[PDB]
C-alpha cells in the first residue's frame, strides 16, 4: 500500500498544471470550509448577542 | 576639516582660487537679489529705483 | 590526495526514511 | 425601585480601603469647614475615595445588570 | 569669440529672465489669494458687550 | 482643578478580542438616546439605514424614520417644506447652528455624539463614569447656575443637568430601567455609533488570526526547507 | 536558443537586481526591513489611492468625507485604519532600518546613507501632511505648531509661513495644498528609493559581521525571496492585528473631533516619532535654538559617516560601543515618552538631560569609545 | 602590567570574534590601505584568511559559534597583517607629505 | 560585480544535500532552546541595564509627577 | 460610476485616477527610453546609421 | 584622478543615456517630438500639481474651485489655461510622434 503523500505526488503534485488545478480546487473548497468554520466559531463565541441571534422576536 | 590639506601647495591653490571663488560668490549674491527682488539691496542701485522694487 | 575527500555524516539532519544507507531510495522519494 | 449601582456602591464603601479614604474625607471636611476664610479646598481626597470606590464597583457591578 | 559669446550671453539673459518670471508667478500662485487678502483687513466688530467680558 | 480622575476599566461584554456587541443593549441605548439624549445632543453621521441590520428590522427602522419630520425641498415655489423622513435620512439636529445650542444651554455646546467614544479618553468607560458619577461638590468650591460638579469631567464643572435616573424612560423588552442599566445601554449604543464596524471587524480579526496561525508554520516550513541547503552545509579547508 | 532572463533588457535588469543578485548568506532578520519598507510603501500608495478616490479635501467636507469613508463606503473603515496603522508600521520599520545601519556600520556607504536621510525627511513631511489631512483638532493644531516652528527662522519666517499657509492661518488653501503634496510626495519617495537601491546595488549589501561578504555569497533567489516573503507575512500579522483589534492605540482620541480654530486641546501630541522630535524641540527653551536642535538631530544621521573612527566596521566585535548604542536606544525611548508627557516637573529636566545625553552620546562619546576599543585591541 | 593582560584577555573574550574563529586582523575594516595590505599578503595567509572569513559567515548564518577548544586564544592571535598595513600607512603618509610639499 | 569574479578562494570544499532529503526542523527544540539561551546569555548584559534604567526613570517620573499633583499640607490657614 | 450615474463618487475617483496616471505614464516612458536605448535610434533614411553618428 | 561623469553611477547613467549617447547625425525636426512629449509631461505635471493645489473635487465645489483658480488665485488662470493648451499640444506632438513612427519605419522596434 503506497503512502498518501506518495499517491498525492504521483497523481497531482508531479505535473505543474495538475498542481495548479488541485491548488485552485482546494482553494475553492477550503475557502468554503473555513468560511463555514470561522463563522460557526464566531456565533458560538457570541451566542445570544448577534443580530440574527436576537432577530426572531422582531420579524414575526 | 582634514589633516592632509596643509602646506605651501594647498595654500597656493587657495590663493589662486579665492578670486574665482569670490567672483562666484558675487554672482551668487547678485542672482539671489535679482531672483528675490530684494528691495533692501535694490533700492540703492540707480536705474532699478524706477521699478519701485 | 583527492580520494581523502569524504562526505561527513549528515545523519543528524536526514529524514526518517533516509537514515540508513543499506536501503535504497526511490521507494520514499515520492513520499518526501 | 432598588438600584444595583447603589447597592454595589454601598458594599464598596463597606470595604476597608474606601472607608479609610472616607475617614480622611471627614478629617479634611472638618479641617476646611472649621475655618471661615481660606482658599484651600480638597477635591483630591474625594478623587482618591472615588478612585478606590469606583474601581471596586467596576470589579463588581455588571453581574446584576443584563 | 566675442560675437559668438555675446550671442550665447544674450540668449542666457533672455532665458534667465523668462525662467525667473515663470517661477515668480508660480511662487506667487502658492502665496495668498484675493479671497484671503480681502477677508483679512476688515473685522466686523461691535461694542454690544459689557465690561469684564471677552470675545 | 488641575487634577483629573481616571475612569476604571469596566468589564464590558465586548471587551474581549473576539466578543461582539450586545445588540439588544444597542437598541435599548438607541431608545435611551431617542427619548433622553436627542433633545440636546446631535448625531450628524448615524442614520436609519445604519440602524437597519444592527438595531431594528427594516420596517421598524422605517417607521421610526417617519416618526420624525425632516426639512426638504425646494417645492414648485422654491420654498423649503416639511416631509416625513425615510431610511436614507440622518438623525434630526436639535439646533440649526451651534450658536443656538450656546444660547439654549447657557453657553455650553453639546458635542456630536457620533464619535464621542473614540473622542474621549477611556471611551464607553468615560461615558459610563461621567453619567453615573454625578455627586454633590466638596465643601469649599462653588459653582454658578447651570453648572454641576463631576469628578470625571476635566475642569470638574460640567454644564449638564443629570440626564438619566431610575425610570426615566420605559423599555420595550421589560428590562428594569434603573439608572445604571440606562447608562450601560447608552454607553454601548454610543460605542456602536462611534464604531459600526465592531462585530464585522472582530470577525475579520478572528479569520485573520486563524489563517495567520496556519500560514506562519507553513511559510516558516518553506523558509527552513529552502534554507536547509545552507543551514546544514559543511565546509572544509584543504591547503597543500 | 538563449536565456530570456539574461537577454531581455527588462528581464536582465530584474535578474541583475532582484533575482540573481549576489547577496550575503548571513544577513540577519534586520535586513528584511528594506523589503518591508518597500512593501509598506506600496501598501500606503494603494491604500491612499483608494482613500483619495473617496476623499474630498475641503474644510467643510474633509471630516465628513473621512466619516463617509469609515461608515458608508464598503470596507472604507478597513482602508482608513489600514492607511493609519500602515504609516505607523512604516515608521517602525524605518526606525529599525536606521538602527540596523547605525549598529552594523552601513553608513560607510555614504551616498546610499545620504539618499536614505533624504528619504527619511520626505517620509516625515508626507506623514505630517497626511496627518493634517483628516482635518481633526490634532491635525489643525499640530499644523499650526509646526508652522510656527517654521516661523521661528529670523527675517524670512513670517513670509515663508504666510506662503506655506496660503494666507494667515491653516485654512482651505493649506488643506488643499497639503492634500496635493501628501498625494504626490510618496512618488518622489519611490523614485528616491530606486536611487537608494541603485546606490546600494553599486557596492552590494552588508553582513552583520561587517566583513567582506564575497567569501560566502548566495543568490537573492530563492533564499531571500522566501525570507522576505516570511517577513512580509509577519509584518502583515502585526499590522492587521493592530488594525482589527487595536486600531486606536497609536492614534489620538480628540483627533476624532472636528477642528475648531477657537477651541484648543489641553495637550498637544502628534504621533510618537513626532513626539521624539517634539521633545528635542522643547528641551531647549528658545525658538530658533529648538528648531536648529530638531534639524541637527535629524542631520546627525548624515553626519555620522564622518564620525566613524574605529577600525572595525560593525558593532559585533566592539562591546563598549554596544553599551553606548543601547543607551542611545534607551533615551530614544525616554525622549519619546517625554514628548508624550506634558511639560511640567520633572519631565522638563528629564527631557533636557535626555536631549543633551543624546547629542553627546552620538557626537563625542562613540568616537571616544571606538578609539578606546582600538587602544585596547592594540590597534593604536 | 599583570592586571592589564587579564583585563585585555577579558575584553578580548567579550569582543566575541574569537568565538567564530577570527583574528583581529581579520575583523579590522577593509579600507583602501587594508585592501592594499591584503593584496600584498602572501598566498597561504590570504587563503587562511579567506577560509576563516567564509567559515565565520557560515557560522553567523547558522547563529552558532565554534566549540570552546576550537576558539582561538589571545596568545596565538598572530598579527600577520600588521607589518604590511604599517608599511602601506607609511607609504601613504610619504605620498601625503609630498603632496603637501 | 556578478558571480564568477567576486572573490579568489582556493582549496575550499563545500558539502550540501537536498531539502527533500533532509528535514526542515532537525531537532527544533533540543538544540533550539540551548542556542537561544546561549545567545541571550551573551547579549543580555548590553541591553537589559539600559532598559532597566528606562524602567526606573519612567517609574520615578510617574511617581514624582503624582507627588507634584499631590496636595501640599504645609499651608493650613 | 460608483453608482448608477456620474456623480460625486465618480468625480472624486476620476480626480484620483487623473492625478495618479501621469506618474504611471512617466514610468512607462522610462521603460520606453530603456527599450529605445537597447535597440538604438532610427534615422529618416531607414538605413544603418552606425557609419556616421554624433 | 578619475572621470566623474562616467564613473559616478547616476552620472554615468545620465551620460550613457543623454550625453554620450550615439545618435544618428541626420535626424530631422520630427525626432524632436519625443523630448517635446517628455517636456509636455513635465509641464503638465507641474501645472496640474498647482491646479490640484488650488482645486477641490466635489460636485458642489468643482466649478466653484475652477472659478476661484481663474479669478482669485494669482496667475491661476494662467496655470489652468497652460494646463489645457499643454494637454492639447501634447496630443499634437503625440500625433506627430506616431506619424513619424509610421512614416520613417520606426515600428520595427
Ligand atoms: C522559542 C522556541 C523555539 C526555538 O527555540 O526555536 C529556535 C529558533 C532559532 O533556531 P536557530 O537554529 O538558532 O537559528 C536558525 C533559525 O531558526 C532560522 O530561522 P530564522 O528564525 O532565522 O528565520 C528568520 C526570521 C524572519 O523574520 C522576519 O523576517 C521578521 C521581520 C521582523 C518582524 C516584522 C516587522 C514589524 C515588527 C514590529 C515590532 O524568522 C523567524 O524569526 C521565525 C518566525 C516564526 C513565526 C512563528 C512560527 C510558528 O528560534 C526561532 O526561530 C525564533 C522564532 C520562532 C520561535
Ligand atoms: C529664500 C527665501 C526668499 C524669500 C523671499 O523671496 O522673500 C521676498 C523678499 C522680497 O524683498 P523685500 O525687500 O521686498 O522684503 C524684505 C522684507 N520682508 C522679507 C520682511 C518682507 O526677499 C527677501 O527677503 C530676500 C531674502 C534673501 C535670503
Ligand atoms: C524661454 C521661453 C519663454 C520666453 C518668452 C516669455 C518671456 C517672459 O518671461 O515674458 C514675461 C511674461 C510676464 O510678464 P509680466 O507679467 O509683466 O512680468 C513682470 C512682473 N514682474 O511672461 C509670461 O507671460 C509667461 C511666459 C511663459 C513662457 C515659458 C513657460 C515655461 C514653463 C515651464
Ligand atoms: C530589541 C532588542 C533586540 C536585541 O536582542 O538586540 C541584540 C542584538 C545582538 O546582536 P549582535 O550583537 O549583532 O549579535 C547577534 C548574535 N551574535 O542586536 C541586534 O540584533 C542589532 C539590532 C540593531 C537595530 C536595533 C534597532 C532598535 C530600535 C532603534 C530605534 C531608533 C534608531 C535611531 C533613530 C534616530
Ligand atoms: C522658496 C519660497 C520662498 C517664499 O516663501 O516665497 C514667497 C514669496 C511671496 O511673495 P509675494 O507673493 O509677493 O507676497 C508678498 C511678500 N513678498 O515669493 C517671493 O517673494 C517670490 C520668490 C521668487 C523666486 C524666484 C527665483 C528665480 C530663479 C531663477 C533661476 C534662473
Ligand atoms: C566590568 C564588568 C564585568 C562583568 C563581569 C561579568 C562576568 C564575566 C565572566 C563570565 C562571562 C559572562 C558572559 C559575558 C558576556 C559578554 C561580556 C560582558 O557582558 O561584559 C560586561 C559588559 C561589557 O563590558 P565593557 O564594555 O568592557 O564595560 C565598560 C564599562 N562601561 O558590561 C556590562 O554589562 C556593564 C554595562 C553597564 C551599563 C550601565 C549604563 C548606565 C547608564 C545608562 C543610561 C541610559 C540613558 C538614560 C537617560 C539619560 C538622560 C537622562
Ligand atoms: C504635415 C504636413 C506635411 C509636412 C511635410 O513636409 O511632409 C513631407 C515630408 C517629406 O519628408 P521625407 O519624405 O523624409 O523627405 C526627405 C527627402 N530628402 O514628410 C514628412 O515629414 C513625413 C512625416 C510627417 C509626420 C506628420 C504628419 C502626420 C501627422 C498625423 C499622424 C497621425 C497618425 C495616427 C494618429 C491616431 C492613432
Ligand atoms: C441637555 C441638558 C443634554 C442632555 C439631555 C444630554 N446632554 Fe450631555 N452635553 C450637554 C451639554 C450642554 C454639554 C457640554 C457641557 C460642557 O460643560 O462642556 C454636553 C457634553 C457631553 C459630553 C462630553 C463631555 C466631555 O468630557 O467632553 C458627553 C460624553 C455627554 N454630554 C454625554 C451625554 C449622554 C450620553 C447623554 C444621554 C444620556 C446626554 N449627554 C444628554 C447637554 C446634554
Ligand atoms: C524611506 C524609505 C526607504 C526605503 C524604501 C529603503 C529601501 C532599502 C532597501 C530595499 C534596502 C535593501 C535591504 C537591505 O539592505 O536590508 C535598503 C538598504 C539600506 N538602507 Fe534603506 N530605505 C529607506 C530608508 C533608509 C533610511 C532612512 C536610511 C538611513 C538613515 C537608509 C539606509 C540604508 C542603508 C545604509 C542600506 C544598506 C544596508 C546594508 O548595506 O546592509 N535607508 N534600503
Ligand atoms: C501615494 C501615496 C499616498 C496617498 C495617495 C495618501 C493619501 C492619504 C489620504 C487621502 C489621507 C486622508 C484620509 C484619512 O486620513 O482618512 C491620508 C492620511 C494619512 N496618510 Fe497618507 N497617503 C499616501 C502615502 C502615505 C505615506 C507614505 C505615509 C507615511 C509614511 C502616509 C501617512 C498618512 C497618515 C499618518 C495619515 C493620517 C491617518 C490618521 O490621521 O489616522 N500616507 N493619506
Ligand atoms: C506618451 C509619451 C511618450 C514619450 C514621453 C516618448 C518618448 C520618446 C523619446 C524621448 C523618443 C526619442 C526621440 C526620437 O527618437 O524621436 C521616442 C522615440 C520613439 N517613440 Fe516615443 N514617447 C511617447 C509616446 C510614444 C508613442 C505614442 C509611440 C508610438 C505609437 C512611441 C513610439 C516611439 C518610437 C518607435 C520611437 C523610436 C523612433 C526612433 O528611434 O527614431 N512613443 N519616444
Ligand atoms: C501630475 C500630473 C497632473 C495633474 C496633477 C493634473 C491635474 C489636473 C487638475 C486638478 C485638473 C482640473 C483643472 C481643470 O479642469 O482646469 C486637470 C484638468 C485637465 N487635465 Fe490634468 N493633470 C495632470 C496631468 C495631465 C496630463 C498628463 C494630461 C493629458 C494627457 C492632462 C490633461 C488635462 C485636461 C485636458 C484637463 C481639462 C482642462 C480643461 O478642460 O479646462 N493633465 N488636471
Tab-separated table of C-alpha atoms in Angstrom, chain I residues 10-72:
chain	number	residue	atom	x	y	z
I	10	UNK	CA	41.263	28.273	-3.172
I	11	UNK	CA	41.136	24.772	-1.662
I	12	UNK	CA	37.661	25.087	-0.121
I	13	UNK	CA	35.227	22.160	-0.259
I	14	UNK	CA	31.505	22.538	0.445
I	15	UNK	CA	29.028	19.724	1.141
I	16	UNK	CA	25.248	20.024	0.964
I	17	UNK	CA	22.219	17.765	0.472
I	18	UNK	CA	18.696	18.011	-0.883
I	19	UNK	CA	15.989	19.865	1.063
I	20	UNK	CA	13.731	16.907	0.301
I	21	UNK	CA	16.395	14.514	1.602
I	22	UNK	CA	16.832	16.408	4.883
I	23	UNK	CA	14.426	17.822	7.469
I	24	UNK	CA	13.241	21.418	7.735
I	25	UNK	CA	13.155	21.250	11.560
I	26	UNK	CA	16.030	18.984	12.631
I	27	UNK	CA	15.671	18.839	16.436
I	28	UNK	CA	13.924	22.209	16.546
I	29	UNK	CA	13.763	22.316	20.363
I	30	UNK	CA	16.513	20.112	21.829
I	31	UNK	CA	19.224	22.329	20.341
I	32	UNK	CA	16.982	25.306	19.579
I	33	UNK	CA	16.441	26.137	23.263
I	34	UNK	CA	20.143	25.921	24.366
I	35	UNK	CA	21.270	28.074	21.422
I	36	UNK	CA	18.655	30.726	22.240
I	37	UNK	CA	19.696	30.622	25.906
I	38	UNK	CA	23.361	30.974	24.899
I	39	UNK	CA	22.627	33.970	22.660
I	40	UNK	CA	20.585	35.669	25.395
I	41	UNK	CA	23.344	34.950	27.919
I	42	UNK	CA	25.930	36.526	25.605
I	43	UNK	CA	23.901	39.605	24.621
I	44	UNK	CA	21.836	40.161	27.778
I	45	UNK	CA	24.298	42.433	29.609
I	46	UNK	CA	24.298	45.013	26.796
I	47	UNK	CA	20.539	45.713	26.545
I	48	UNK	CA	18.993	44.895	29.929
I	49	UNK	CA	20.893	47.530	32.029
I	50	UNK	CA	19.844	50.395	29.688
I	51	UNK	CA	16.281	49.060	29.594
I	52	UNK	CA	16.022	48.824	33.375
I	53	UNK	CA	17.351	52.384	33.593
I	54	UNK	CA	14.438	53.289	31.277
I	55	UNK	CA	12.033	51.485	33.615
I	56	UNK	CA	13.460	53.196	36.716
I	57	UNK	CA	13.358	56.619	35.029
I	58	UNK	CA	9.768	56.006	33.875
I	59	UNK	CA	8.582	54.903	37.326
I	60	UNK	CA	10.407	57.717	39.141
I	61	UNK	CA	8.984	60.266	36.709
I	62	UNK	CA	5.445	58.973	37.214
I	63	UNK	CA	5.894	58.927	40.998
I	64	UNK	CA	7.354	62.447	41.168
I	65	UNK	CA	4.662	63.718	38.792
I	66	UNK	CA	1.976	62.245	41.051
I	67	UNK	CA	3.634	63.918	44.043
I	68	UNK	CA	3.621	67.187	42.087
I	69	UNK	CA	-0.134	66.707	41.731
I	70	UNK	CA	-0.243	65.690	45.411
I	71	UNK	CA	-1.619	68.350	47.737
I	72	UNK	CA	0.931	70.056	49.965
